[PDB]
Amino acid sequence: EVYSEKMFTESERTYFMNVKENRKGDYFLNIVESKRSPSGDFERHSIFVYEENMNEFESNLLKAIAVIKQKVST
Amino acid sequence: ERGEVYSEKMFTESERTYFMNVKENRKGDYFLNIVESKRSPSGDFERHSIFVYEENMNEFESNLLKAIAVIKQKV
Ligand SMILES: [Mg+2]
Ligand SMILES: [Mg+2]
């Protein structure tokens, strides 16, 4: 791991933002959603993005988020 | 599609394809859904899906951009 940030929320949902380096030396982004169940177990949902797709992934996320931000401020 | 505000599909040169969706719940709140569909060596498609709700959108965006900035500066 090169970078790792844990984003708690006020609910039982926590997000992890991880940057890791592979063997070829390439970087990848890993976004994780971890949700606590009433039993104290965790469900985790994990997405990976290769550095070669980073600009396009970022542009696409920003566009989708922008829709929500506009609605919220609307 | 009723309940879907926004939907985009992103092919890559890898076995990973992405979907960025904005959905609307019963109350009219918007929420984000990010999906990675990964083709396995065998031909089965695994699907990974994350949801982010309105109350966490700004912080999620900020944290996502901060991690991406790490990659930007390290290339
Ligand atoms: Mg919490
Ligand atoms: Mg492909």
CATH of domain B1-75: 3.10.450.700
Cα(A45)–Cα(A9) distance, integer angstroms: 16
Torsional class of B43: left (φ above 0), alpha (ψ -120 to 50), beta (otherwise): left
Q: Write the CA distances from A61 to A22, A37, A42, B34, integer angstroms.
A: 23, 28, 26, 8
Closest Cα to residue B16, out of A49, A30, A17, A28?
A: A49
Query: Cβ contacts (< 8 Å) between A48 and chain B: which residues?
Result: 16, 36
Ligand at minimal distance from the CA of A15 is 1
Ligand at minimal distance from the CA of A6 is 1
User: What is the separation of C-alpha A43 from the centre of its chain, rounded to a whole number of angstroms?
Assistant: 15
**Residue ranges of the domains in chain B?**
1-75
Q: Write the CA distances from A40 to A11, A32, A34, A36, A46, integer angstroms.
A: 14, 18, 12, 6, 19
- Angle, vertex CA B69, rays to CA B66 and CA B72, nearest 5: 165
Architecture of domain A1-74: Roll (3.10)
Cα(B60)–Cα(A7) distance, integer angstroms: 8
Cα(A67)–Cα(A64) distance, integer angstroms: 5
The residue in chain A having the minimum alpha-carbon distance to the alpha carbon of residue B59 is A7
Interface of B with A in 27-46 (CB under 8 A): 30-32, 34-36
Reported resolution, Å: 1.9
CB within 8 Å of B9: residues ≥ 6 apart: B17, B18, B19
Contact A57, B18 (CB under 8 A): yes
CB within 8 Å of B48: residues ≥ 6 apart: A45, A46, A47, B35, B36, B37, B38
Closest Cα to residue B50, out of A66, A7, A70, A28?
A: A7
Q: Write the CA distances from A52 to A49, B15, B16, integer angstroms.
A: 8, 13, 12
Rg (CA), chain B: 15
Contact A11, A33 (CB under 8 A): no
Rg (CA), chain A: 15
Would you give the DSSP letter of residue B2?
A: T
Mapped onto helix, strand or coil, the DSSP state of residue B63 is helix
**Interchain proximity B22–A64, CB inside 8 Å:** yes
